[PDB]
Amino acid sequence: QNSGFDLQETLVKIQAEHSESGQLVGVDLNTGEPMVAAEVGVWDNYCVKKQLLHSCTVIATNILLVDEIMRA
Amino acid sequence: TGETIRSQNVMAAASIANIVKSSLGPVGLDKMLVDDIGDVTITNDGATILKLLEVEHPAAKVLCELADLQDKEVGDGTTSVVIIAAELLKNADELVKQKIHPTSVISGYRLACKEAVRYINENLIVNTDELGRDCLINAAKTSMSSKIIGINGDFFANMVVDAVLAIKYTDIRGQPRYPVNSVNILKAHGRSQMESMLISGYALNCVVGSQGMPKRIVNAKIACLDFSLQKTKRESDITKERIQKILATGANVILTTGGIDDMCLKYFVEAGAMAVRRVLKRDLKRIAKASGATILSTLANFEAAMLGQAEEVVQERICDDELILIKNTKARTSASIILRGANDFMCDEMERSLHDALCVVKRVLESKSVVPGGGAVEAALSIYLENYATSMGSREQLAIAEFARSLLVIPNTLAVNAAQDSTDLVAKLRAFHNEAQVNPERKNLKWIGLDLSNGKPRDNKQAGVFEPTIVKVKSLKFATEAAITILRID
Amino acid sequence: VYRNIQACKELAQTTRTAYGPNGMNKMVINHLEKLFVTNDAATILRELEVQHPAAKMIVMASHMQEQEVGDGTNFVLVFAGALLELAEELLRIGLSVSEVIEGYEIACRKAHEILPNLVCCSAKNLRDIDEVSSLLRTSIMSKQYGNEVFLAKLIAQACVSIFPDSGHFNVDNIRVCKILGSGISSSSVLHGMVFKKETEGDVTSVKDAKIAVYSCPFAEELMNFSKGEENLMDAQVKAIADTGANVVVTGGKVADMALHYANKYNIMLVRLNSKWDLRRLCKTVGATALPRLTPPVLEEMGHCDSVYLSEVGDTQVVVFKHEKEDGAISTIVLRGSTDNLMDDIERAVDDGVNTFKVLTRDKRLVPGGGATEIELAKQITSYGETCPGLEQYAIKKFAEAFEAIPRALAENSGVKANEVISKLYAVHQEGNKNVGLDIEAEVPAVKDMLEAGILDTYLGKYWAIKLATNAAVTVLRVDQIIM
Amino acid sequence: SGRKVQSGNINAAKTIADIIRTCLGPKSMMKMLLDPMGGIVMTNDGNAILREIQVQHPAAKSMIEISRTQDEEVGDGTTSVIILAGEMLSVAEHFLEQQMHPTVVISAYRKALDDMISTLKKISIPVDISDSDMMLNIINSSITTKAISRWSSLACNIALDAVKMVQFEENGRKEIDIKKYARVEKIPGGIIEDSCVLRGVMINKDVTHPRMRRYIKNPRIVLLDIQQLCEDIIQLKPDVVITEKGISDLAQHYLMRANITAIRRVRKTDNNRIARACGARIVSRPEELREDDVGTGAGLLEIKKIGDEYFTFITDCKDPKACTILLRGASKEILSEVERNLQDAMQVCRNVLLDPQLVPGGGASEMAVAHALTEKSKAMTGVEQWPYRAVAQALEVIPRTLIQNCGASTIRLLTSLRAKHTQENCETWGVNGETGTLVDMKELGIWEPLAVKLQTYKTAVETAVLLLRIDDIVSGH
Ligand SMILES: Nc1ncnc2c1ncn2[C@@H]1O[C@H](COP(=O)(O)OP(=O)(O)O)[C@@H](O)[C@H]1O
Ligand SMILES: Nc1ncnc2c1ncn2[C@@H]1O[C@H](COP(=O)(O)OP(=O)(O)O)[C@@H](O)[C@H]1O
Ligand SMILES: Nc1ncnc2c1ncn2[C@@H]1O[C@H](COP(=O)(O)OP(=O)(O)O)[C@@H](O)[C@H]1O
Structure with a gap:
């Protein structure tokens, strides 16, 4: 979406590409096309992704578990 | 709040004028007039706008009445007279506000109007003589400009001017008169308009009547009728006895609007009569008034010398179309213009341009006294009247000065509707007309007006933008009368 | 984001009328309540306390332009305003912000290399006092009245030609x-x-x-x-x-x-x-x-x-x-x-000295008075259709942003901008680069700007274009802030 | 006031245009119209929306009336003219606020219209009439994406005969045609395949007692609107004389004494077609009674009780311009659509008789003429070049809306479509209305008549210049 392309069309194309071929295909922010993300060299940190999962799950669970906001 | 009802009347007049101001000139914009039941009307000329605008203010009603009265005199300048009256009202209101009593203003306006009508009468044009040839040509071209036929304009111009001059009457008073309906149109199929040649008489594009007409008959008498010469079952069957009687009276060319006779061929070689279907009433009346004959509903009875005469009849094919050359009759009314082309629909603008050229020519043919158009006369009188006013010394000096200043609204409005800044056009007009008086040698400069097509000053005596003197004289008089009537109110 | 564009539009409109030798001078009231009348754009910018952050950013860009070229700030403001208006139109069409960002960047890159092909350089050197006379006339005539330039320029250039030694100058x-x-x-x-x-x-x-x-x-x-x-x-x-x-x-x-x-x-x-x-x-x-x-x-x-x-x-x-x-x-x-x-006169002399210093830095001159802007606009808008993709819209709007300068310069002299810009664009394809907009004539007429001698420096416009495009891009890259 | 009234005019035009700007193409959206009682109706035909809507602006009423009079004259294309006029008037805004007079804008619009007419004449692909295969292709191009897709086979041959049976020799050779003289015969009941075409005028009425010499080998119809006239009819001794008054048994006996067959309670919509087909004449004045009273008419008459109801058959007419076309089926819900689509087909054939040509569909023609106008604007100079370019840039709405109401993004597809017209010379590609992707229309098979395209462009330009010419609305409010 941030590159101006269609939000759902790009995701559909990426999902189809990853389904037909096992390569971890990603989005290309110059043409809105499924890109291999390995040859292009767009690598991300492994520990960042791990901490991302750990943080998001705990925050979402904690917020979902609340009720009866009180004025202390 | 509110006061000085005179100012209220002036403002009502100003609003009424502003309703119609933008439509002045041939290039004016349209107004869409909506009634209570919702219908709409589109028009350019402001005369019908005033005739259709729902006026409610009593003061504006006076202007509407005066404009309508102006319409009944010559039928032109109603927009101009309304605008001039409104400008006079505004200027007179300002003069009243500066502590000048309306009586002196009215007197100054009367003197200014009289001086203007006297000045115009000694600076108009009466050159619409037999020696006026190029002026009519380029007047027709200006009325026909901004068209693709400008490449061969001169031929159509001289053709149309020759046609209009060759058909003039001479009335009881001796003043030449021209009916617009005298000349008609005639389409043709094939080559384009460049080969069109003027027809000296009325020509009908229909079935061929007969070949019995010689190259030029010594006598061609128009025995026009209105029935169909058809065999049926002073005669019960109107085929032989009535035509024999009319020929005995001396009928050479018997005209039959309806059907042709079954056996006309044998009778048309010994008498030479005419049989062509669908003779137009518009042209039938014109040819009858040309030769001098009258239409006979019945023949069972005056018929010898009352019928008209034609000098010669020509049987020829023009643009692959047979036409009847009933020409050179008693009175010059019989004439037509062939429209070479393929159909009247593709040359609709061409025939409309020819019609408007004929109209603008007949405007200047009658009322031999003519004045330049395009705001030239207004600028000339505006220059005149300031110098006239500065020599008075009375209390009416400012009245005449404001009259002169407000008289420039017509060229200003013309420039505004022409999509050019009116300031430059008006200033250039005034500058050209200034040396027309302060410099005697540059006397041939008064006829300088504004050209609406190019938005630059241009001589109009040479161009041909012309108006009758009576139209402008009456417009000025009626504007002054309306202004005086409004100023008298309190 | 349209609020930033609007604030920039009014900022440019405020000082647009002061452009050119017919600047409609304003009345300035400083905090100490001094009745002060001037036509300089920097002075009115200094006294105006621009509050909107987008206007602040354009003002900083103008200050940077003045800090190292010494003149042309009003050009920067007018150009940035035109760029942001046309960017607003492009956004309303449906373009993403990024697309117009790279379109503007590539257009600026192309313009920077088109520009050096429009040079009519200085004659021989900083010396020949009567020559740097004709060189220094344009800036002085632009800032203050066109009447006094003949003397003000001579005074300002005679004093600065005293020490053209070692190619080092200091305005102070x-x-x-x-x-x-x-x-x-x-x-x-x-x-x-x-x-x-x-x-x-x-x-x-x-x-x-x-x-x-x-x-x-x-x-x-x-x-x-x-x-x-x-x-x-x-x-x-x-x-x-x-x-x-x-x-x-x-x-x-x-x-x-x-x-x-x-x-x-x-x-x-x-x-x-x-x-x-x-x-x-x-x-x-x-x-x-x-x-x-x-x-x-x-x-x-x-x-x-x-x-x-x-x-x-x-x-x-x-x-x-x-x-x-x-x-x-x-x-x-x-x-x-x-x-x-x-x-x-003091600030006009300062601008003249700065222009002379820019000439010391480089001897290249470019025909001013709407000549170079219209030539750049024509070249860029011709290059626009040679580049398929979504960047052509931004490129053409950039060409129009150049076009907006002579339009304002004409409006400041009471002449119909559309007529003069059309005439200039038409005549500029045959009566090429050296023609510009004549000021003295009240008719919308054009005149060659090489015999007329009205020329302005090349680095001045180079840096002005660069800084204005950078300001427009960097103000287009924000989206919102609560205020 | 001043230019604000024109701005209001063009704003009303723009809004009334963009009410239905999405209701075109093969994927038209469905508007909802609700009456002030609670009912709801959904429609895909912009004429209906413009009909049941109420507008308080006279300019909007003028545009609606323009769409109406354009509907009956040519049939379809009613939404395209509305969209084009709305966009041209909307793009006039930029120049009107730049203080330029409406006269120069109108003049630029007129040159643009002339250039578009020339371009359309240039780009049109020739088509020869009477070729059934490409006729069927035209039917699939136009009459389809309607309720006739499974019933278009019969409409094809119905139109094929209809175009040949209203021929007019008025101004030239067969190029003149009309739509309201073909004797349509719509009778519900039975299977739809019973419909056919017959040569000759078809009359629903007949004598009450057909126990007389009704059908004769040479019907020479005489029109009339009295015993003395009954004997005066024998002035030429015709076999059939048609009146518009009732006939009694004694009157019938008088008729076979006079050997004529009168008719009663026949609508004028039938009498005029009878007269056109047979070339009859009307005369009752004794002085006017001449050889030109009775004209040659048909050559065969037949009596048939089709559908256990009294009818009259008149075949082998003198003028084969008002012939018999028969419609059969279950209900009238589709046969009216068959009528209007065969009207479109007759316009196709008539314009092919005038200009044997077709143009690419799916916005290809619009983009082609826009490219032609934009490239032509480069050479010409003057202040008026801006409106000349603006009309070209604004005429591209048709591909734009086709892409819009298809799912695909308009901006990228339009940019690519332009790119496929400027660097390529003889392409004239367009946009598919079903998939929303670029496709060569000469391969897809979508074409439009020159008559309808020329009429749409001319009417849009005329409406734009008319609504820009209107300076004041002052006769009241
Ligand atoms: N061909 C022309 N060239 C210049 N001015 C013209 C031309 N025709 C008409 N006008 C101007 O139009 C004005 C009014 O004409 P018109 O509108 O026809 O009369 P009215 O206002 O009574 O309807 C006149 O003052 C005249 O100067
Ligand atoms: N005679 C002239 N005609 C047209 N433009 C001129 C003339 N003299 C100067 N200029 C223009 O003035 C502009 C610069 O002046 P201005 O915008 O007032 O201040 P700054 O130098 O800060 O930009 C230059 O672009 C130059 O082209
Ligand atoms: N299958 C299709 N693919 C692309 N365009 C089409 C298709 N069918 C119709 N059109 C377009 O639709 C236009 C006309 O239909 P429409 O606009 O819906 O109604 P109207 O006929 O009233 O204008 C034509 O210009 C044609 O190009």
């Missing part, structure tokens, strides 16, 4: 002294810092002197107190007379006994020291300020070369000339009826 060398009085005719070129003093007991023939700098201005028992005060001031004047000092400065007024004491030891009591002079004097003589009358010493003193009173200009003025560089500083005497019309 070209100083301006304000002298009230008659018209601008009596204004001319002098040398050395100049201001007016009070006392008359001054010697003209002075060698390297010792200059004082001041940072702070000025029954029997009554007679005893008067005598004690007199002796104390005797001690003070003897202390200042130590180490053979010959001049004294003070920001206050004169004193009869003090001037008597100065005359006794032959000291010129220099007075009427302005709050704007204390540290520029120290910079130009390498001195330091002294708090009171007790701590003058040999080390804490200045040194001039020649001090005298010159009555040229019908006023008595002291001059410190031939400093350590012996030809570095060169003032200009200005004469005017009143100050509000004198600062306009």
Whole structure:
């Protein structure tokens, strides 16, 4: 979406590409096309992704578990 | 709040004028007039706008009445007279506000109007003589400009001017008169308009009547009728006895609007009569008034010398179309213009341009006294009247000065509707007309007006933008009368 | 995001009318309530307190342009405003912000290399005073009135052509002294810092002197107190007379006994020291300020070369000339009826000096007056359809953003902008680059701008274009902030 | 006031245009119209929306009336003219606020219209009439994406005969045609395949007692609107004389004495077609009674009780311009659509007789003429070049809306479509209305008549210049 392309069309194309071929295909922010993300060299940190999962799950669970906001 | 009802009347007049101001000139914009039941009307000329605008203010009603009265005199300048009256009202209101009593203003306006009508009468044009040839040509071209036929304009111009001059009457008073309906149109199929040649008489594009007409008959008498010469079952069957009687009276060319006779061929070689279907009433009346004959509903009875005469009849094919050359009759009314082309629909603008050229020519043919158009006369009188006013010394000096200043609204409005800044056009007009008086040698400069097509000053005596003197004289008089009537109110 | 574009649009509209030699000058009321009338864009920008952050960013871009080119700020504002308007139109079409961002960037990159093909460089060198005359006319004529340029330019370039040595210049060398009085005719070129003093007991023939700098201005028992005060001031004047000092400065007024004491030891009591002079004097003589009358010493003193009173200009003025560089500083005497019309000449002279410095940095010239802008617009809009993709819209809008400059310059002279821009664009394809917009004619007519000689520097427009495009891009990259 | 009234005019035009700007193409959206009682109706035909809507602006009423009079004259294309006029009037805004007079804008619009007419004449692909295969292709191009897709086979041959049976020899050779003279015969009941075409005028009425000499080998119809006239009819002794008054048994006996067959309670919509087909004449004045009373008419008459109801058959007419076309089926819900689509087909054939050509569909023609106008604007100079370019840039709405109401993004597809017209010379590609992707229309098979395209462009330009010419609305409010 941030590159101006269609939000759902790009995701559909990426999902189809990853389904037909096992390569971890990603989005290309110059043409809105499924890109291999390995040859292009767009690598991300492994520990960042791990901490991302750990943080998001705990925050979402904690917020979902609340009720009866009180004025202390 | 509110006061000085005179100012209220002036403002009502100003609003009424502003309703119609933008439509002045041939290039004016349209107004869409909506009634209570919702219908709409589109028009350019402001005369019908005033005739259709729902006026409610009593003061504006006076202007509407005066404009309508102006319409009944010559039928032109109603927009101009309304605008001039409104400008006079505004200027007179300002003069009243500066502590000048309306009586002196009215007197100054009367003197200014009289001086203007006297000045115009000694600076108009009466050159619409037999020696006026190029002026009519380029007047027709200006009325026909901004068209693709400008490449061969001169031929159509001289053709149309020759046609209009060759058909003039001479009335009881001796003043030449021209009916617009005298000349008609005639389409043709094939080559384009460049080969069109003027027809000296009325020509009908229909079935061929007969070949019995010689190259030029010594006598061609128009025995026009209105029935169909058809065999049926002073005669019960109107085929032989009535035509024999009319020929005995001396009928050479018997005209039959309806059907042709079954056996006309044998009778048309010994008498030479005419049989062509669908003779137009518009042209039938014109040819009858040309030769001098009258239409006979019945023949069972005056018929010898009352019928008209034609000098010669020509049987020829023009643009692959047979036409009847009933020409050179008693009175010059019989004439037509062939429209070479393929159909009247593709040359609709061409025939409309020819019609408007004929109209603008007949405007200047009658009322031999003519004045330049395009705001030239207004600028000339505006220059005149300031110098006239500065020599008075009375209390009416400012009245005449404001009259002169407000008289420039017509060229200003013309420039505004022409999509050019009116300031430059008006200033250039005034500058050209200034040396027309302060410099005697540059006397041939008064006829300088504004050209609406190019938005630059241009001589109009040479161009041909012309108006009758009576139209402008009456417009000025009626504007002054309306202004005086409004100023008298309190 | 459209609010930022709007704020920038009004910012550009405010100072657009001041563009060109027909700037509609405004009335300026500073915080101290001074009635001040001027046409300079930087001055009105300084007094206007731009509050919207987008306007602030464009103002900073203009300041950076002025900081290193010295002129062209109004061009930057007008160009950035046009860019943002056309970007708003593109966004309303449906383009993403990023697409117009790279479109503008590539258009600017193309323009930067198109530009050097429009050069009619300087003739021979900074010398030939009568030539840098014609070179310096355009900026002066643009800033202040076109009538006075013939003299103002000569005055401003004669003073700056004094020291074209080693290819190094400093604007602070070209100083301006304000002298009230008659018209601008009596204004001319002098040398050395100049201001007016009070006392008359001054010697003209002075060698390297010792200059004082001041940072702070000025029954029997009554007679005893008067005598004690007199002796104390005797001690003070003897202390200042130590180490053979010959001049004294003070920001206050004169004193009869003090001037008597100065005359006794032959000291010129220099007075009427302005709050704007204390540290520029120290910079130009390498001195330091002294708090009171007790701590003058040999080390804490200045040194001039020649001090005298010159009555040229019908006023008595002291001059410190031939400093350590012996030809570095060169003032200009200005004469005017009143100050509000004198600062306009001052800022015009400053802009002229900056243009001369830019010429020192590079000798390339480009035909101004709407010539180069319309040529750049034509070239870029021709390049636009040669580039398929979504960037063509941004490129064409960039070409129109160039087009917006001569349009404003024409509107500032009371001429229909559409007619003149159409005529210019039509004639610029055959009657090529050197043609521009004539000012004197009230008709929308054009005229070649090489024989007319109205030319402006090349680096000026290069940097102005670069900074304006950068400002437009960097203000298009924000989306919102609560305010 | 001043230019604000024109701005209001064009704003009303723009809003009334963009009410239905999405209701075109093969994927038209469905508007909802609710009456002030609670009912709801959904429609895909912009004419209906413009009909049941109420507008308080006279300019909007003028545009609606323009769409109406354009509907009956040519049939379809009613939404395209509305969209084009709305966009041209909307793009006139930029120049009107730039203080330029409406006259120069109108003049630029007129030159643009002339250039578009020339371009359309240039780009049109020739088509020869009477070729059934490409006729069927045209039917699939136009009459389809309607309720006739499974019933278009019969409409094809119905139109094929209809175009040949209203021929007019008025101004030239067969190029003149009309739509309201073909004797339509719509009778519900039975299987739809019973419909056919017959040569000759078809009359629903007949004598009450057909026990007389009704059908004769040479019907020479005489029109009339009295015993003395009954004997005066024998002035030429015709076999059939048609009146518009009732006939009694004694009147019938008088008729076989006179050997004529009168008719009663026949609508004028039938009598005029009878007269056109047979070339009859009307005369009752004794003086006017001449050889030109009775004209040659048909050559065969037949009596048939089709559908156990009294009818009249008149075949082998003198003028084969008002012939019999029969419609059969279950209900009238589709046969009216068959009528209007065969009207479109007759316009196709008539314009092919005038200009044997077709143009690419799916916005290809619009983009082609826009490219032609934009490239032509480069050479010409003057202040008026800006409107000349603006009309070209604004005429591209048709591909834009086709992409819009298809799912695909308009901006990228339009940019690519332009890119496929400027660097390529003889392409004239367009956008597919079903998939929303670029496709060569000469391969897809979408074409439009020159008549309808020329009429749409001309009417849009005329409406734009008319609504820009209107300076004041001052006769009241
Ligand atoms: N061909 C022309 N060239 C210049 N001006 C013209 C031309 N025709 C008409 N006008 C101007 O139009 C004005 C009014 O004409 P018109 O509108 O026809 O009369 P009215 O206002 O009574 O309807 C006149 O003052 C005249 O100067
Ligand atoms: N005679 C002239 N005609 C047209 N433009 C001129 C003329 N003289 C100067 N200019 C223009 O003035 C512009 C710069 O002046 P201005 O915008 O007022 O201040 P700045 O120098 O800060 O931009 C230049 O672009 C130059 O083209
Ligand atoms: N299958 C299709 N693919 C692309 N365009 C089409 C298709 N069918 C119709 N069109 C377009 O639709 C236009 C006309 O239909 P429409 O606009 O819906 O109604 P109207 O016929 O009233 O204008 C034509 O210009 C044609 O190009």
